[PDB]
């Protein structure tokens, strides 16, 4: 097979270097052994039969932040990854990942919950259990379907596959049988009344998920040509139109200091709608009209002119008014920023409250009280995760001694650059000393009581033992958590075992031999 490995890798680059327009980001390991290289598309005639099996390049309007992550996902995601792209991926590693998926999917079915409930903590609607959902079952039982939508130059992970299962984010069907429908608008699921309401022809259609469904004459006549015949559909009774389009609102989220809601029920010009165009009952249309006629008078909302997004900004304290400017939101899949208004930025107030710690020692934290790296902490620290700080404090104190042994004047710098927690108002005289005093340092180990010296020492002694118990491999992971003062990884514990290694590996590799996995272990 060693000969075959070369026959693959030699022909592999032939496939890449012909098909990758971006090889430099793929394999930047060598730059001078080749020019800067790209690949270029060219117009072509098409056979009237063979191209039927092709698919479209796009079905949607794509923004710039997606295009980069899509081309990056197309080519470079796997080339830089450890496991490698799905193309040249071995059967064994694909098979290993496939077990861990199955081990996770059944835990979700073991709950009996639904799709939307797991994701959402205040769901509007609730769909199916997952024992009945065909898609989730189709993914669980067939491994190849997991790989179809995953692009060839992409990595084969667990998280990406479970996304499809717990959310069917698939778009239209880009067969050459489907009809490209233009108007596809997607409103939020709180503007809806009954789900049985008639189908908005202007808005998004369920038929686009499969071209075989939108392969009817009406769809082809719509996009490809103009109409000549007016075809009449049965209308609805004035009662049935309303009954479908009834909305219901919390009575407590009616107050005049929330314009995100109240402006939904006024025209563009600034005139109140009827209940019908508002999709409401009688009393809920009263309780809003009072608030408009009152909010008009507190000048949040206009009397007669056009509604403005500044008016649509609901009222609240300075923080939620200020933070929402300061709050820049970033995907963790993709480093780009969401522009304001382009995303629902989320916060459970009740959960943050209940997520706090019911156990707290304010005295134990008086040492680290003035010390803070971040602006403020929304966390109420435990006893354990407090010890981590006092050891961080001890550490920075040790290096001051390390530098002072080499001659550095420690007191000289701490007068110029140390930043107090309490900063007065900024003026022309205060801003230069304080902008130099940005840094936050611990106190001297010398100017202390023994118990204050003991805790910083004992705290350092605890975590020094844990990292000895923790293996060496996951050096960085401790350093990620060491900043944010998370102590879970630091909490490791291995238990005793009387079994010999030969009995172990002979037993484990036997097990794995059944599922495949001819490759034994080596420890």
């Amino acid at each position: 097979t060693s000969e075959q490995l070369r026959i693959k890798n030699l022909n592999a680059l032939k496939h890449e270097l012909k098909n990758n327009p971006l090889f430099d980001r793929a394999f930047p390991e060598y730059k001078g052994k080749k020019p800067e290289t790209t690949v270029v598309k060219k117009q072509e005639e098409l056979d009237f039969i063979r191209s039927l099996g092709l698919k479209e390049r796009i079905n949607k309007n794509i923004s710039l932040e997606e295009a980069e992550h899509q081309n990056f996902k197309q080519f470079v995601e796997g080339f830089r990854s450890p496991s490698g792209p799905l193309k040249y991926m071995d059967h064994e590693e694909k098979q290993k990942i496939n077990f861990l998926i199955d081990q996770k999917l059944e835990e979700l079915e073991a709950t009996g919950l639904t799709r939307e409930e797991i994701l959402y903590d205040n769901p509007t609607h609730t769909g199916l259990p997952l024992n009945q959902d065909p898609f989730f079952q189709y993914i669980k039982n067939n491994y190849t379907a997991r790989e179809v939508l995953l692009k060839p130059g992409e990595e084969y992970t667990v998280q990406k596959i479970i996304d499809l299962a717990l959310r069917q984010d698939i778009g239209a069907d880009p067969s050459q049988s489907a009809a490209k429908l233009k108007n596809q608008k997607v409103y939020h699921a709180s503007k809806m009344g009954l789900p049985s309401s008639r189908k908005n022809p202007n808005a998004f259609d369920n038929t686009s998920y499969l071209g075989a469904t939108s392969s009817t004459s009406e769809h082809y006549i719509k996009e490809l040509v103009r109409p000549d015949r007016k075809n009449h559909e049965i209308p609805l009774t004035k009662a049935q139109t309303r009954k479908q389009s009834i909305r219901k609102i919390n009575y407590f989220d009616i107050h005049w200091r929330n314009t995100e809601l109240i402006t939904q029920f006024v025209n563009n010009s600034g005139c109140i709608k009827n209940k019908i165009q508002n999709r409401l009952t009688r009393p809920q249309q009263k309780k809003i009209a009072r608030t408009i006629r009152l909010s008009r008078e507190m000048l949040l909302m206009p009397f007669r002119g056009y509604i403005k997004p500044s008016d649509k900004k609901s009222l609240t304290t300075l923080q939620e008014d200020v933070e929402n400017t300061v709050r820049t939101a970033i995907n963790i899949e993709t480093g780009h920023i969401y522009i304001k208004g382009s995303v629902n930025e989320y916060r459970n107030v009740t959960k943050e409250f209940e997520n706090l710690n019911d156990n707290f020692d304010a005295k134990r934290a008086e040492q680290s009280k003035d010390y803070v790296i971040d602006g403020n902490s929304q966390k109420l620290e435990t006893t354990e995760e407090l010890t981590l700080l006092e050891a961080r404090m001890h550490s920075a104190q040790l290096k001051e001694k390390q530098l002072k042994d080499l001659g550095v004047d420690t007191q000289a710098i701490r007068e110029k650059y140390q930043a107090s927690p309490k900063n007065p108002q900024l003026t022309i005289d205060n801003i230069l000393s304080i902008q130099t005093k940005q840094y936050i340092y611990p106190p001297e180990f010398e100017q202390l009581d023994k118990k204050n010296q003991d805790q910083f020492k004992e705290s350092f002694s605890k975590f020094q033992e844990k990292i000895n118990q923790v293996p060496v491999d996951k050096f960085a992971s401790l350093l990620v958590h060491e900043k944010a003062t998370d102590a879970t990884e630091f909490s490791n514990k291995i238990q005793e075992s009387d079994i010999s290694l030969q009995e172990s590996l002979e037993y484990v590799n036997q097990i794995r031999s059944r599922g495949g996995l001819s490759t034994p272990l080596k420890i």
């Binding site: 007016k230 009449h232 559909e233 209308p235 563009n268 010009s269 007669r304 002119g305």
Partner: protein
Amino acid sequence: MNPIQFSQFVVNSITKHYFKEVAQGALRPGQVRREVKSVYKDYNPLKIHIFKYKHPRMLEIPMPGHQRRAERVEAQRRRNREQINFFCRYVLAKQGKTIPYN
């Protein structure tokens, strides 16, 4: 007329009245009537006295008592129309007939 009075003309225009700003510098044909009629719709013509008629001798004002009964009558005239707007549509969808544009 003065530059100081200019700002007082614009500030008064925003708050008390309607306001746009065109980006391309010119005025698309029929841009006015659409933007006017949007207000003619938002305001109910069917409750404002001016928007029923143009000729002043129709805009002459009766007693309130003589006017309330007129509202009952015209309201009933609409309900007869609103039903036949539903009837003829209902029938045509049953006969399945079609109107050619050409």
